[PDB]
Amino acid sequence: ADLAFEAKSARDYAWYDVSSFLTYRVLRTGELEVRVRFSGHDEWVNVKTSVRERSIPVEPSECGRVNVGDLLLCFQEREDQALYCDGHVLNIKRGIHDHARCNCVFLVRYELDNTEESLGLERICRRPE
Ligand SMILES: [Zn+2]
């Protein structure tokens, strides 16, 4: 099936699903940027760093494929806002569950500010592969 992407916002440094792409531009420094139209407004993002293939949700029967050190798109809830930003799995507490719901617990370190949090499979999306 078709490719779908997400783009990193230069405002909050989170990732959003790209609905479509509009145009591109080169910087005199040489970087390639792309104008991205989001889902749900309009940004320029570094192709090389800030554009990638959309993260994939993980099904309870899959949780074995997520490991310590992995990079993950994590749902990050705070006061008002909530963002989907990059983090790395530091430690995993495996639970007992079936195919219905994953109660394994993932300690991840957010890339931006280096903070830590315990997330359930329901709040993480893996990178392809
Ligand atoms: Zn699990």
Side-chain angles (χ1 to χ4, degrees):
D2 283 6
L3 264 28
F5 312 86
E6 55 195 25
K8 205 222 234 92
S9 189
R11 306 181 32 257
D12 45 18
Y13 303 109
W15 293 85
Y16 301 77
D17 295 340
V18 179
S19 160
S20 68
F21 301 75
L22 304 177
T23 172
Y24 79 97
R25 68 178 190 192
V26 195
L27 301 182
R28 57 159 301 274
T29 67
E31 288 121 21
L32 236 40
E33 277 181 344
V34 80
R35 188 158 185 85
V36 155
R37 173 74 59 93
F38 290 111
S39 288
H41 188 241
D42 266 15
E43 267 214 49
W44 281 104
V45 290
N46 183 295
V47 154
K48 187 60 221 67
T49 66
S50 300
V51 175
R52 70 185 179 190
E53 179 177 344
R54 193 167 313 181
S55 304
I56 307 107
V58 196
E59 183 101 19
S61 42
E62 288 175 25
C63 71
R65 70 178 303 153
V66 174
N67 311 303
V68 158
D70 283 20
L71 171 86
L72 299 180
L73 187 66
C74 311
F75 185 64
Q76 176 196 268
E77 280 217 275
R78 288 175 170 179
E79 287 175 320
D80 187 352
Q81 75 190 6
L83 308 172
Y84 297 87
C85 50
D86 291 345
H88 291 92
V89 177
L90 305 178
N91 160 82
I92 319 179
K93 294 163 192 261
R94 296 288 176 180
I96 343 151
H97 60 79
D98 58 346
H99 58 294
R101 174 97 168 179
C102 160
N103 58 18
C104 297
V105 164
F106 303 79
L107 194 60
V108 330
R109 176 181 290 120
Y110 294 111
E111 198 176 49
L112 186 66
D113 48 29
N114 239 244
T115 53
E116 312 188 19
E117 189 182 9
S118 290
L119 292 159
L121 193 78
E122 85 274 355
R123 299 221 167 183
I124 72 112
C125 291
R126 61 168 184 89
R127 301 296 311 131
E129 305 175 3

Short mmCIF file of all heavy atoms in Angstrom, two decimals, residues 60 63 94 97 102-104, ligand 1:
data_model
loop_
_atom_site.label_atom_id
_atom_site.label_comp_id
_atom_site.label_asym_id
_atom_site.label_seq_id
_atom_site.Cartn_x
_atom_site.Cartn_y
_atom_site.Cartn_z
N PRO A 60 -1.14 -5.40 20.26
CA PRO A 60 -0.77 -6.15 21.47
C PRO A 60 0.01 -7.43 21.17
O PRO A 60 0.95 -7.74 21.91
CB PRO A 60 -2.13 -6.51 22.07
CG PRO A 60 -3.00 -5.36 21.69
CD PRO A 60 -2.53 -4.90 20.33
N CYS A 63 3.88 -6.54 20.52
CA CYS A 63 4.73 -5.85 21.50
C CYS A 63 6.12 -6.45 21.66
O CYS A 63 7.02 -5.80 22.18
CB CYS A 63 4.04 -5.81 22.86
SG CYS A 63 3.95 -7.42 23.66
N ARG A 94 7.64 -6.28 31.06
CA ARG A 94 6.70 -7.11 30.33
C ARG A 94 5.60 -7.63 31.26
O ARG A 94 5.88 -8.09 32.36
CB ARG A 94 7.43 -8.28 29.66
CG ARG A 94 8.44 -7.85 28.60
CD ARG A 94 7.73 -7.36 27.34
NE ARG A 94 8.67 -6.86 26.34
CZ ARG A 94 8.31 -6.37 25.16
NH1 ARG A 94 7.03 -6.31 24.83
NH2 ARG A 94 9.23 -5.94 24.31
N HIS A 97 -0.60 -10.61 29.17
CA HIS A 97 -1.81 -10.20 28.47
C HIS A 97 -1.95 -11.00 27.19
O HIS A 97 -1.02 -11.68 26.75
CB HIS A 97 -1.73 -8.71 28.14
CG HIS A 97 -0.56 -8.36 27.28
ND1 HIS A 97 -0.55 -8.57 25.91
CD2 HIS A 97 0.65 -7.83 27.58
CE1 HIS A 97 0.61 -8.17 25.42
NE2 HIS A 97 1.35 -7.72 26.41
N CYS A 102 -2.24 -4.60 25.50
CA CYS A 102 -0.88 -4.77 25.98
C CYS A 102 -0.62 -3.97 27.25
O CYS A 102 -0.61 -2.74 27.23
CB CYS A 102 0.13 -4.37 24.90
SG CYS A 102 1.78 -3.99 25.54
N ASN A 103 -0.40 -4.68 28.36
CA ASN A 103 -0.12 -4.02 29.64
C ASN A 103 1.36 -3.97 29.97
O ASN A 103 1.74 -3.71 31.12
CB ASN A 103 -0.91 -4.67 30.77
CG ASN A 103 -0.63 -6.15 30.92
OD1 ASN A 103 0.38 -6.66 30.41
ND2 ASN A 103 -1.51 -6.86 31.62
N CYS A 104 2.21 -4.22 28.98
CA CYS A 104 3.64 -4.02 29.14
C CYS A 104 3.92 -2.54 29.32
O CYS A 104 3.22 -1.69 28.76
CB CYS A 104 4.40 -4.57 27.93
SG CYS A 104 4.23 -6.35 27.67
ZN ZN B 1 2.79 -6.28 25.52
#
